[PDB]
């Protein structure tokens, strides 16, 4: 890919399981007799990760638009491999098993996913405000998970109840069918532009769609699809 970047051609780079790259290094180091570090990993983990990742950079001659995957052993995000990857990224997207087990197949945790370009100068003022509000909601939800778990929904205040309802609606709404998921899911794929996503979430945060039951936000596109499904259900 560096040859194409050096000549000016834009490159889309898709590496799969950078972890597997690190695990192999670990096995090679174990066979090489090096002194093991942390959970059996190689002593030269950071240097190997740097040597691989610093080559994945957009330079002044060309740009590499790199998308990587990382496998977390078990479900431990504190494992040395993902912990080393985290500092080598502009955008991080954290998929959680708990979200996935809720049939939310995108499975992305909004609170554990960040990006450097989520900047009002770069992405737009409305997009930035909508994203920050969609995080402040679901942060109020994460702060109240135990109270809902033990005492129940009733003990919360009225505005807290509203924020929790909107947060659960947002969790359902982040779900989205994929065109490549037709093999095991019957939902047709949906492509939601960034403008439509921002508008849908801004409308959801304003209050439009409060009357809609949460189940209608599951496996939908923009807010218009949810409204159409609600009207179909009457």
């Amino acid at each position: 890919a560096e040859y194409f970047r050096d000549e000016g051609r834009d490159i889309l780079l898709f590496i799969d399981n950078i972890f597997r790259f690190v695990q192999a290094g670990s096995e090679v180091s174990s066979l090489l007799g090096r002194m093991p570090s942390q959970v059996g990993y190689q002593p030269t983990l950071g240097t190997e990760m740097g040597e691989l990742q610093e080559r994945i950079t957009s330079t002044k001659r060309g740009s590499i638009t790199s998308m990587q995957a990382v496998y977390v052993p078990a479900d431990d995000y504190t494992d040395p491999a993902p912990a080393t990857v985290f500092s080598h990224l502009d955008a991080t997207i954290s998929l959680e098993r708990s979200i996935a087990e809720r049939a939310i197949f995108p499975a992305v945790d909004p609170l554990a996913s960040t990006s450097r370009i989520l900047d009002p100068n770069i992405v737009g003022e409305e997009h930035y405000r909508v994203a920050q509000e969609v995080k402040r909601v679901l942060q109020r939800y994460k702060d109240l998970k135990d109270i809902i778990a033990i005492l129940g929904m009733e003990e919360l205040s009225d505005e807290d109840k509203l924020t929790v309802q909107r947060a659960r609606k947002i969790e359902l709404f982040f779900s989205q069918p994929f065109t490549v998921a037709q093999q095991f899911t019957g939902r047709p794929g949906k492509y939601v532009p960034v403008k439509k996503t921002v508008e849908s979430f801004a409308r959801l945060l304003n209050g439009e769609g409060d009357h809609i039951p949460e189940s209608f936000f599951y496996m939908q596109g923009d807010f218009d699809d949810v409204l159409a499904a609600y009207e179909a259900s009457q």
Partner: protein, 48 residues
């Protein structure tokens, strides 16, 4: 309650019943006595 039953069975006169027993036709003003638990943790009752 059966005292109410017996007495109302008599004195049926609307003018006689003009005192409280009377039914205001306009019903312009109404009042609601709401008895709500004083401390929460009650569950969904306080809200219901």
């Amino acid at each position: 309650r059966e005292v109410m039953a017996n007495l109302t069975a008599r004195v049926v006169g609307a003018a006689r019943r003009g005192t409280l027993l009377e039914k205001r036709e306009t019903v312009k003003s109404v009042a609601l006595l709401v008895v709500t638990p004083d401390r929460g943790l009650c569950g969904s009752l306080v809200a219901n």
